[PDB]
Structures are given as C-alpha cells and as structure tokens.
Amino acid sequence: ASRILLNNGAKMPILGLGTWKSPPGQVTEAVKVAIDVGYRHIDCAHVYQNENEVGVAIQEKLREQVVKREELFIVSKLWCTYHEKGLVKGACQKTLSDLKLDYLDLYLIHWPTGFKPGKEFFPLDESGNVVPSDTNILDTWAAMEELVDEGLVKAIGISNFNHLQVEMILNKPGLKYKPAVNQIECHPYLTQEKLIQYCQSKGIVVTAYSPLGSPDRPWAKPEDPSLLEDPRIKAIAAKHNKTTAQVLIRFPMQRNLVVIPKSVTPERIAENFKVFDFELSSQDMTTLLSYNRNWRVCALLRCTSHKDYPFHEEF
Numbered sequence: 635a636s637r638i639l640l641n642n643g644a645k646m647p648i649l650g651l652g653t654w655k656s657p658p659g660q661v662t663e664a665v666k667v668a669i670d671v672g673y674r675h676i677d678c679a680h681v682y683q684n685e686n687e688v689g690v691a692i693q694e695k696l697r698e699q700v701v702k703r704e705e706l707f708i709v710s711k712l713w714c715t716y717h718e719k720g721l722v723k724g725a726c727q728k729t730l731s732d733l734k735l736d737y738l739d740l741y742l743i744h745w746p747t748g749f750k751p752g753k754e755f756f757p758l759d760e761s762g763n764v765v766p767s768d769t770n771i772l773d774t775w776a777a778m779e780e781l782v783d784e785g786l787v788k789a790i791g792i793s794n795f796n797h798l799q800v801e802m803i804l805n806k807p808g809l810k811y812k813p814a815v816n817q818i819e820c821h822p823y824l825t826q827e828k829l830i831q832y833c834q835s836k837g838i839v840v841t842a843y844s845p846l847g848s849p850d851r852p853w854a855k856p857e858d859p860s861l862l863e864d865p866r867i868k869a870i871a872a873k874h875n876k877t878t879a880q881v882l883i884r885f886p887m888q889r890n891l892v893v894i895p896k897s898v899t900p901e902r903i904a905e906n907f908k909v910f911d912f913e914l915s916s917q918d919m920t921t922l923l924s925y926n927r928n929w930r931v932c933a934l935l936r937c938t939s940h941k942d943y944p945f946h947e948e949f
C-alpha cells in the first residue's frame with residue numbers, strides 16, 4: 635500500500651521526495667515533476683535554504699488542480715538554533731510562510747541537539763566547536779506539542795534521536811503527544827535493525843533518509859563506500875530488471891519504513907517512484923541487510939561534545 639497509518643490517525647505516503655542539496659533554481663521544477671508523476675510527500679527543512687522555491691511548486695500544483703492540499707503530506711524540521719521555547723512557533727511559521735502552507739502534516743525536531751540562537755546555523759566557538767544551547771529535548775518537545783494544539787502542524791516527530799532519547803520523550807513527565815515519526819539515516823551500509831525495531835515496537839514510524847548513500851553529500855571522500863556502485867547491489871537489481879536506486883528505495887519500503895530519495899533530475903524523479911510493481915524476496919532483504927558497515931553520511935563530528943550528541947550510544 636502507498637501509505638502508512640501514523641499514531642495521530644493520519645496516513646503518511648511511504649515514498650517522498652527529498653530536497654536537501656536541491657538547488658533553489660532547480661527544486662521548483664523538481665517538485666512539480668514529482669507531483670505530476672505521483673509523489674504526494676515532500677521532505678523539507680528550513681536549514682536546506684530552499685523552502686521558498688519548494689513552496690512555489692506546491693502552490694502552482696494546487697492552483698492548477700493537479701492535487702488538493704489534503705492529498706499532500708508536507709514535512710519540515712525545526713533547526714537546532716531554534717530549540718528555545720520562545721523560538722519554536724516563529725521557526726514553524728517562517729517555514730509555513732516559505733512553503734506557502736497554513737499547516738504542516740509533520741514537523742520534526744531535526745536533531746536532538748540545541749545550538750546557540752542567532753543568524754548562524756552552526757554557531758562556533760574559537761576552536762570551531764559548535765556552541766550548545768542550554769535547552770533540553772523535553773522542553774523542546776513541549777513546544778512542539780503546542781504547535782499541534784494551535785493547528786499549525788497535524789503531527790510532530792523527531793529525527794536523529796537514539797533509542798535512549800526516544801525513550802526520554804516517551805517517558806517525559808506529562809507527555810501529551812507521542813512522536814509520530816523518527817527520521818533516521820538508513821541504507822544497506824547502515825541498516826539500523828535495533829533502533830528501527832525499538833521505534834516500531836512503540837508505534838513510531840521510521841523514515842529512512844539518504845537511502846542511496848547521498849552521492850552528492852558535500853564531504854564525500856574517495857575511499858567511502860558507494861551503494862550505487864556496489865556490484866552486489868547491482869546484481870540484485872539486474873536480477874529484478876530494475877535499477878540499483880529502485881532496489882535501494884524498495885528495500886526500506888519492505889521493512890515498513892518511509893523513504894525519501896532526493897533528486898532534481900526529472901528522469902530519476904520518475905524512475906524513483908516506480909518501485910511499487912516489484913518485490914525483493916526475503917533472501918534479497920537479508921542479503922542487503924548483511925552489507926551493514928555502520929557507515930554514516932550524516933554525523934557531523936564538530937558536535938561530538940554536545941551532551942545530546944546522538945551517536946556515541948550503540949543505537
């Protein structure tokens with residue numbers, strides 16, 4: 635099926651379009667094409683600095699009556715320099731105004747770590763360490779709950795939270811809404827069995843990011859593994875008469891995950907949605923799972939000293 639039921643009683647499309655690194659002069663086209671081609675979920679964030687252009691696309695397709703707003707599932711994230719209680723609603727409203735929406739279907743705390751507020755997204759000290767904010771995840775979550783109670787967002791969630799930080803929220807005193815989603819990195823080199831089982835056992839839907847290994851990540855290094863070029867993954871693809879990306883997108887779908895491949899290439903945007911007509915076998919799934927290397931696209935090492943840095947813990 636195309637959607638998964640969230641614990642807020644809404645349905646989330648299991649395939650969405652990613653927008654991190656999508657250039658502001660190509661992302662309007664990319665989102666139009668995606669909607670034309672069937673996508674109903676767009677993954678956004680203020681920190682991606684292109685929400686305005688994404689919004690233009692959404693608006694035009696609504697205007698054109700290609701889609702209705704209820705059919706869309708639009709997701710954004712609160713950036714780290716806005717975890718202070720007084721900053722969350724305006725952060726959300728900026729996103730709404732940029733995307734030209736009057737509500738978000740899902741709004742996530744982008745990272746468990748709060749940073750010092752200001753103009754700077756990664757405020758640094760004279761040793762290039764990120765400057766923390768004294769906020770904690772629990773008060774931040776309480777501020778996300780108010781957005782639900784004010785009608786600005788239909789559901790709230792988390793991203794890059796480890797199982798202990800998920801547990802902190804579920805066990806938060808006076809918790810009012812549980813997280814609907816945990817959005818984490820997940821692909822055959824970072825399979826996440828443990829964190830995924832934890833979350834699903836609690837009725838928290840997991841969204842897999844960087845499902846293709848983020849080949850356009852800005853810090854790519856030569857000896858880094860490459861999913862797209864992995865001969866073993868290519869062989870499974872060939873066996874199924876599909877592309878490697880198709881296998882890499884279909885792979886988290888069969889784990890009951892949501893997946894958001896990024897592309898600005900219209901041929902790829904199309905290709906990437908054509909993943910509902912074939913099935914990986916259990917052997918394929920276990921074989922893909924066997925490629926785990928605990929390799930992360932996204933683990934910015936200048937945050938390692940943050941108290942809430944999520945990746946020291948095993949899972």
Ligand SMILES: NC(=O)c1ccc[n+]([C@@H]2O[C@H](COP(=O)([O-])OP(=O)(O)OC[C@H]3O[C@@H](n4cnc5c(N)ncnc54)[C@H](OP(=O)(O)O)[C@@H]3O)[C@@H](O)[C@H]2O)c1
Nearest residue numbers: 652653654843844845846847848850879895896897898899
């Ligand atoms: N929560 C967070 O912390 C977080 C972190 C990272 C990512 N995310 C989200 O997850 C989305 C996906 O992750 P990602 O952007 O890191 O990377 P990704 O989706 O794994 O890979 C995107 C790269 O793959 C290429 N590509 C797309 N389809 C392809 C295909 N069929 N064949 C060959 N290459 C293809 C794209 O090229 P072109 O664009 O040139 O076609 C781009 O260079 C992001 O865009 C963002 O929405 C969230």
Ligand SMILES: O=C(O)Cc1nn(Cc2nc3cc(C(F)(F)F)ccc3s2)c(=O)c2ccccc12
Nearest residue numbers: 654681745746747932933934937940942943944
């Ligand atoms: O975030 C995006 O979606 C993609 C993303 N990932 N990363 C790697 C990161 N690693 C982190 C680690 C922590 C930490 F929690 F661990 F402290 C906190 C924050 C980050 S950002 C980036 O540095 C980044 C920079 C600009 C725009 C998007 C991103």
